Design a protein around this ligand. Structure first.
Ligand SMILES: Nc1ncnc2c1ncn2[C@@H]1O[C@H](COP(=O)(O)OP(=O)(O)NP(=O)(O)O)[C@@H](O)[C@H]1O
Ligand SMILES: Nc1ncnc2c1ncn2[C@@H]1O[C@H](COP(=O)(O)OP(=O)(O)NP(=O)(O)O)[C@@H](O)[C@H]1O
Ligand SMILES: Nc1ncnc2c1ncn2[C@@H]1O[C@H](COP(=O)(O)OP(=O)(O)NP(=O)(O)O)[C@@H](O)[C@H]1O
Ligand SMILES: Nc1ncnc2c1ncn2[C@@H]1O[C@H](COP(=O)(O)OP(=O)(O)NP(=O)(O)O)[C@@H](O)[C@H]1O
Ligand SMILES: Nc1ncnc2c1ncn2[C@@H]1O[C@H](COP(=O)(O)OP(=O)(O)NP(=O)(O)O)[C@@H](O)[C@H]1O
Ligand SMILES: Nc1ncnc2c1ncn2[C@@H]1O[C@H](COP(=O)(O)OP(=O)(O)NP(=O)(O)O)[C@@H](O)[C@H]1O
Ligand SMILES: [Mg+2]
Ligand SMILES: [Mg+2]
Ligand SMILES: [Mg+2]
Lengths: 286, 290, 291, 291, 291, 292
DNA sequence: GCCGCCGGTCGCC
DNA sequence: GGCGACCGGCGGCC
């Protein structure tokens, strides 16, 4: 399709450059814009025609960073020295395979398996790793911030949805089957792609509370849409916060490795994530 | 009736050209506009006025594509077409089916405004319906609408799709009007006349929809009335588990070939419309498909 | 009343010319404007000013076509070969006397009797003649469109009100009497602001008697006296052959033009005291051409 | 005090002239403006600024004609030929005193006695006289048009209030005392930021005694003392000819103008202390123009 | 806190001059503006951008007159012929102390004794005196105008709150205690910046003791001690002449002009220990002009 | 981060200068602006354009004062024996050095979990006077008594200090109380502002009785007593004061905090390693000769 | 105050 | 006389 013949003025080209600048520096919120470049914000807020451009540029930047650009490219920029590499080795999970899956999972290339699940005892580092990814993607949203009876508001536009210490109520289970499966909401269909979801919890989430009693009616359907990871070993208190770079170096290194190994397991996506294969451990990871 | 003797400035001519450019490339949604041409959208959205124009152009393009141009214009060797292969296995005449579709999609079938596909599951009922629905500019599903108000925003659509639907006794009164091509009161009260918009309808189902659900029971009072407005097809043959997603290109090829052939056979059946679509006539098969 | 001494730029003259064109070409809805002239609509819809001018011009054209010009001028333009003339003769009715009645009724000059009633067996063409007149006037409103509990909405700014198969309920019989009698609605008395507001002609086609107002689950005849004061009745008893086809506004314009061309004293004799029932064909009084 | 030493631009002076012209020709509604001058109305409504100017100018003209200018100026321009003059002789009322009393009453000069009451048998012309006077003043409202539960809404901005065949209810008896006595509502107090501003003349017509306020399904005389002080009572005892016809503003203006030139000193002989019942004709008090 | 430089253009300078002219001639309401300078109001309403300036200027003028100017300056410009001086002597109170106290009171300088209370039999002129003071401040409000369940709304933006024929109920005792004592309401606290001060003076007229709180169908005295500390009580016992007439600004300002010129020693001696009652005439200290 | 290479007109530079001027003069409300400078306010409100500029300037100035500039810089300034606050602290048996130094960290949200100060003691001992003295120095603060009874924590965001005077905690709102008193932002704060974490507002509480006991109907419950103790710091005002010490002023606060900033921080670092619910009292020998 | 458009008039055909 | 493109004016925008 041939684009239109419209030629813009100086102001329009300046606005387009401003949108590119906002998209490049990951400035998607007013607070972030004030914290980063207060001078330009003060200059723009002087009048109506300046204030409107702020909202327009923010919306266009969000759309460009979410829909028109692959999210994985936002994450890609001594492999053994990375904290995350050691952490997955302790949990007997191959750092390479889990890294490759995240790239496909964030890129909606895993089919119906749109949801990741971290399972283990409390204080094993589940939320620390999960929250590290949420700070690496352009925009993220948490279920906890939403209303108690409307947990899935403002799902469209997010690069990732995080559900920390969550549990599924039978009154809203039908909505969970859609989003966790990646099916678009009916509102999205009417007005016009799914959003990856990550869930961390202490118990078994496949059990659904129904009244004052637990039930297993929906246990079968939720299993196909999810991948389970076991974080059993307690973490030392000195680990601290995981930096966005630690994710960046880990994902970038895993990207360049041979991909054919991941495709073999990708033929039949199992609900359970396979453990470390000692015969396939990379030499640099040792 | 003479067009007004006004003259357009250089600014309005650009808007008029953009309106034609919208219809030329079948872009009718803001998402499609963003996906196809981002630079022009970004340039337009940097000024109060620069926006009033996006919505105005979209509205004008929708109206022009839906009402001022025949729908079939958007649709217009043959043995290799998957659509023909589909209807061949289903014991129906591939040529005669398309010739009715063109008259049906153009609101030229009188009271029989509704088409119905029926059969066991995994027989291609839904795949064929979406292939037609993708080709038309604008289409809407009854599934997306509210349960208590299934017929909202029917106007402005070139087609309406109803997937695995069931008719309830509460909505049987509104269903009869929309399925029969009769204009709704909302359009009548707005437009000014008593008959204007026109909406084709296509329905798929695994069960007989002529039966109406009332309470926890099923009645047959409205069966005769719904039979007049509808046309039935029986997809009773299991399809080969190899066929893929039917595309608009497949439909356009099927309709283009069927359009130019002889139209002498169709109008004989058009004198009296049978409730069931006629099946394969062995002697009347076109020599191309023998 | 000397007009104002104001003056306006070329844009205002263009707007006035556009309003005059809308009045001339009989365009009164946005969809009609889109159908007749898409180019001018697309040019006008390029900015806020044009989109406001569209609504202003539409409203002004509607007002001019409704209140600034007598409705009869929108109807004027072998007489025996006219389909409508045959129909009234078949129904044993004089075409001239009916036509001359319409030209005074459509202009609200008949006073209290603002309503015509078409009554008789079904499928005799009662709706066909009623709708034919409606399609000729600038704009008409139908009671069937309006909501269940509020039938008399959107009456203002209309030329003709059509009500087919109508039944008067006791709940709304009081509001019904106002419009059917030519009395103005009370909201127009204040929104316009004095008792100078006019009313709208009403035409009713029914298969049964409408003087029997429905109350609950029982028929009552207390209101029959008041309704008969305001109404004129016709009887479509003789069913027509199913080959008359859809009547056209050209037939109405042709028939109405001929009626005004003849003598008017013939109708004036019956105008001294209007009768509820319409007198039938008189062989002596028939027009020389129609014989 | 000396007003602001401003300098009106070219456009603003046009607005001032338009506002003056609207007041001059008594054009107070959009529907009146369309009939009087459609040209200027279209030229103005050609754009947003013109519509805003129309909306502002209408309110300014209403304010100028209501508050800043006395109403009597629009009433003031042999006498035996006047219809109204003969009418009051039938009801044994002196036309001169009635004319003089109305002129002082319309401008809120009577103080407490702010209400005039017409009473008598039906068909004596009680409504005919009230309507003619009402349509002479620029803007008037009717209690009938207003909401049943809120009959005294939209009081401000009216030069006269007309109440036909009214009956006072116990639910609204308290609000009626203020309006009939010229007491402004709290809206005219707190939003107009004072204790009292308008005078809102009110006229009432009835066939029975309105001082008997209905209480539930019973009649009570508690409020008889309070209301009878606020009103002035006129009795239309004699039924007039059926062919009196509709009165017009021309008859109203001529009658008031003639009463203006006559002697005034006779009026205040009684006006120092009004009585509830209007005094009748005495042969001595009859002017020679009517003898 | 040196002012910003901000060199303004002629458009803003003219608006500032208009704002000053508003305060100078006491034009604080739209109705007063229309009644005083109609030409300027007509010119200003010719456009939307000109109509916005009226609402911009009125608020600033009201704020300037309320907070940026001492209220007593609006009061201060033979003596033995002033009606108030004569009236206060009839009640056996010293006019000089009353006038001196009022000026100190209106500027909120009495401390916690913010509210004045006038009590006595009817027809003693209590209400007439209260109106004269309220008519002289820029803007005044009433508790009578407010809603029954929320009588203490719209407190801000007023220089004096008048409560005529007042009485205190138990459902509003907590609100009345704060307002009568000068304590700012929580609205000012959450709109301005923490415990401010503006408050408002209050004047009360009553025919009965207001210290008796009405609860249910029983009179109670729980808050009698708390209320008395906040008011200064005056007993208006002597009936006044029926034909005294209303009081005006010229009477109050003339009276207040004399009082300010005298020494503050007489007042400041009693001001050290504020009493609930006000001292009467002392022949040992009556001013020579009033002897 | 390289700032966007745009350049503003004369009006934009003037507006930025006005925003700076509003910050420098501690003007944050319409009433304060009208009181300080009526002429500029009139000039701005003369037109529709300036009425929007006023609101934008105020909204930007509040944000600049609250989030961009540390609050403690508004306390420090650009006869120590005679300072009124020093005497008042000595009357109530507390070291003026440690009280001032702790404030400079509590007001800057640097104390970690212990985000609140608690004043306890009999009436008329000077609890209210000192509490309001700190508030008058910070740019903008909000007091709880203004809000609705059922909604106590409205408009908490965008304030430098939260004042709660003689208040008592109820079980119906004890769940929200542990949030602000703990320094973790409310749920709506993250959503409207994208980040799971945005620092909280310091809180100062005065009380005549022990607030660690929560009202539960017509009954006192102590289930939440433990949870409040690691969020709070307690000071006891056990000595009454004579009516010879009027309202405290910002001048006293600035002088007091200025001296506490210049002295060594070793006496604070010893206690700051492990915070205690009880604030240690006067040490007889540790008192520096500048206050002996 | 900002960026847009309609419009007049002089400049050139 | 006609066609051209230039700059200044004005728009509405809460
Ligand atoms: N705010 C923090 N500052 C420093 N270290 C932290 C912080 N939060 C967590 N950690 C460290 O991160 C590791 C685990 O963090 P945490 O988020 O509590 O893990 P978890 O297993 O997801 N916990 P839980 O929420 O109990 O399931 C430990 O080494 C902690 O010391
Ligand atoms: N992604 C796909 N979408 C549609 N059809 C598919 C797809 N993949 C394979 N097919 C095959 O294509 C044919 C179309 O089947 P489908 O249209 O889903 O059946 P149907 O009869 O309309 N189903 P039902 O919804 O039960 O009425 C079948 O043979 C499918 O097995
Ligand atoms: N599509 C049509 N359907 C029916 N009648 C038609 C049609 N087109 C033309 N006509 C003519 O219209 C005549 C009847 O018109 P119609 O208005 O339906 O009658 P009616 O007496 O008003 N009907 P009803 O509503 O049953 O009382 C027929 O006899 C035909 O001559
Ligand atoms: N066109 C006319 N309209 C009204 N009244 C007319 C007309 N022509 C003559 N009249 C007479 O003029 C008088 C007007 O009376 P009118 O004001 O309608 O009633 P009223 O005396 O107030 N009584 P009522 O309405 O019965 O309570 C009556 O005597 C009518 O007969
Ligand atoms: N029109 C008037 N306006 C004001 N004061 C008047 C007026 N006429 C007389 N007066 C004087 O005011 C006195 C009563 O006025 P008013 O202000 O109502 O007094 P009051 O003692 O406060 N009344 P009350 O409300 O009965 O307790 C009369 O006795 C006259 O001296
Ligand atoms: N504006 C003032 N007026 C009077 N006394 C004041 C004022 N400001 C301070 N004081 C005095 O300064 C001291 C401060 O006491 P304060 O801080 O109010 O004590 P408290 O125990 O918190 N009060 P309370 O509110 O009764 O619980 C007291 O002696 C007050 O009387
Ligand atoms: Mg956690
Ligand atoms: Mg299907
Ligand atoms: Mg009184």
């Amino acid at each position: 399709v041939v684009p239109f013949n419209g030629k813009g003025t100086k102001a329009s080209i300046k606005f387009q450059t401003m949108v590119n600048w906002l998209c490049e520096n990951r400035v998607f919120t007013e607070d972030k814009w004030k914290l980063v470049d207060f001078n330009q914000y003060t200059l723009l807020s002087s009048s109506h025609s300046g204030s409107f451009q702020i909202q327009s540029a923010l919306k266009l930047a969000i759309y460009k960073a979410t829909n028109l650009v692959p999210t994985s490219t936002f994450l890609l920029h001594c492999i053994k020295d990375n904290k995350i590499v050691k952490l997955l080795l302790c949990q007997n999970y191959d750092p390479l395979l889990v890294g490759q899956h995240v790239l496909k999972w964030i890129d909606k290339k895993c089919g119906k398996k749109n949801t990741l699940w971290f399972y283990g005892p409390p204080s094993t580092g589940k939320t620390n790793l999960a929250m590290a990814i949420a700070k690496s993607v352009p925009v993220y949203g948490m279920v906890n911030w939403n209303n108690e009876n409307f947990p899935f508001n403002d799902v469209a536009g997010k690069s990732l949805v995080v559900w920390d210490e969550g549990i599924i109520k039978s009154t809203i289970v039908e909505a969970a089957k859609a989003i966790l499966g990646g099916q678009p909401t009916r509102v999205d269909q009417k007005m016009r792609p799914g959003v990856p979801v990550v869930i961390t919890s202490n118990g078994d989430i496949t059990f659904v509370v129904s009244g004052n009693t637990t039930t297993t009616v929906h246990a079968k359907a939720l299993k196909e849409r999810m991948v389970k990871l076991n974080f059993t070993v307690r973490c030392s208190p000195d680990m601290g916060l995981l930096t966005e770079a630690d994710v960046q170096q880990w994902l970038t290194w895993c990207n360049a490795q041979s991909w054919d190994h991941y495709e073999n397991w990708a033929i039949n996506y199992t609900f359970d994530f396979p453990g470390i294969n000692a015969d396939a451990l990379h030499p640099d990871l040792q």
